[PDB]
Design an enzyme around this catalytic site. Sequence first.
Site, PDB file in Angstrom:
ATOM      1  N   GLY A  35       0.957  -1.225  -0.045  1.00 24.57           N
ATOM      2  CA  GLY A  35       0.115   0.094  -0.162  1.00 24.57           C
ATOM      3  C   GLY A  35       0.928   1.305   0.005  1.00 24.57           C
ATOM      4  N   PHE A  37       1.405   3.106   2.526  1.00 21.79           N
ATOM      5  CA  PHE A  37       2.188   3.043   3.765  1.00 21.79           C
ATOM      6  C   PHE A  37       3.447   2.287   3.504  1.00 21.79           C
ATOM      7  CE2 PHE A  37      -0.741  -0.653   3.699  1.00 21.79           C
ATOM      8  CZ  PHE A  37       0.412  -1.678   3.724  1.00 21.79           C
ATOM      9  N   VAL A  40       3.598  -5.342   3.706  1.00 23.19           N
ATOM     10  CA  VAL A  40       3.231  -6.165   4.784  1.00 23.19           C
ATOM     11  C   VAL A  40       3.941  -7.497   4.388  1.00 23.19           C
ATOM     12  CG1 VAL A  40       1.635  -7.272   6.526  1.00 23.19           C
ATOM     13  CG2 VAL A  40       1.081  -4.969   5.284  1.00 23.19           C
ATOM     14  N   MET A 107      -0.815 -12.825  13.506  1.00 22.67           N
ATOM     15  CA  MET A 107      -1.023 -13.654  12.446  1.00 22.67           C
ATOM     16  C   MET A 107      -2.577 -13.842  12.295  1.00 22.67           C
ATOM     17  SD  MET A 107      -0.144 -14.333   9.243  1.00 22.67           S
ATOM     18  CE  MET A 107      -0.310 -15.138   7.792  1.00 22.67           C
ATOM     19  N   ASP A 154     -10.499   4.613   7.818  1.00 22.47           N
ATOM     20  CA  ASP A 154     -10.399   3.846   6.697  1.00 22.47           C
ATOM     21  C   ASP A 154     -10.821   2.451   6.747  1.00 22.47           C
ATOM     22  OD1 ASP A 154      -9.811   3.526   4.102  1.00 22.47           O
ATOM     23  OD2 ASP A 154      -7.695   2.657   4.291  1.00 22.47           O
TER      24      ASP A 154
END
Length: 349
Positions: A35, A37, A40, A107, A154
Amino acid sequence: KVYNDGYDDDNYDYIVKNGEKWMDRYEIDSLIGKGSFGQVVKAYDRVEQEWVAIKIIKNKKAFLNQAQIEVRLLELMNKHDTEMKYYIVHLKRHFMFRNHLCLVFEMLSYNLYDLLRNTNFRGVSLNLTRKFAQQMCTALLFLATPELSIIHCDLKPENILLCNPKRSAIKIVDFGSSCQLGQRIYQYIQSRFYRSPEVLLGMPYDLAIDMWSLGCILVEMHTGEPLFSGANEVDQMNKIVEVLGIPPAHILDQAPKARKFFEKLPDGTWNLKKTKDGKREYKPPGTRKLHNILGVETGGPGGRRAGESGHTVADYLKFKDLILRMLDYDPKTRIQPYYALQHSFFKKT
Ligand SMILES: O=c1c2c(ccc3nc(-c4cccnc4)sc32)ncn1C1CC1
């Protein structure tokens, strides 16, 4: 040019490499996310004997400073000592690594957009939609506790994740845009489909913007498609107006950006901004009824639920009432988590 001594690409992202070991602890498996940001990754924590998701923030001042806010709020939420704190993702720890702030999360399983996609966008059942709705309302109530007062900013299907692949328990992720009710710093926020009228209109906003987003999300979880799927702000506002009509005058009168979408007549009422040569693109205001989108009296969305249990007319009429209260134009009277949870849609069987 070489970026960050070769560890970064040209977009300030860490060049992920499958199989890499960080600090003699984390084994990087693969990229699982990407993203504005940063990224991940899935990774195995040798020390703790468990899988984690590591959010690798971009190596640039602006993104770092924001992630520091994210870390503060994550830690504040996880710290809090009610049992409602477990609808929020767990930030296990954070660390700096090759000039990247890295946030380590538990996770979870896959997100609600991926879930929608597994049923080819047929939607999930109203019974499962209800379970998501109840948990999200309960989570939004947590966020509303006065010591937190956090606006997620968001919410969308992508940022609601299942805990385990075979069960309905969910958690909210990505507080990378979040703020508290005092310290609001951005005017252009929320993903476009899930963006509230107050934000579209450039007005002040509070925790109610998340309830708007939830209204939009819940409908999409059952129909399989976004309720308000605008290509830009003007489209987005126009699609909202198709379903809910012209926003009330008392709001438009205080809206810095009212004239981006609307125009005010001599008599003090508001219409949509008048269009070039009349060319028609939108349904007239309030005409695209939620009652038909949901298929309340016609076997659910698209007719696909006709003659299934757990999808009665009375069930849909309740669901529709809840959603319309979630999509109240006025953030002062829009339904709030406590009262949403008391709604007849949730009442026991
Ligand atoms: O993607 C995630 C996952 C997460 C835990 C936290 C988390 N925050 C995310 C995120 C996304 C966008 C922005 N900030 C955080 S993605 C994510 N557990 C599992 N997974 C999916 C592979 C199963």
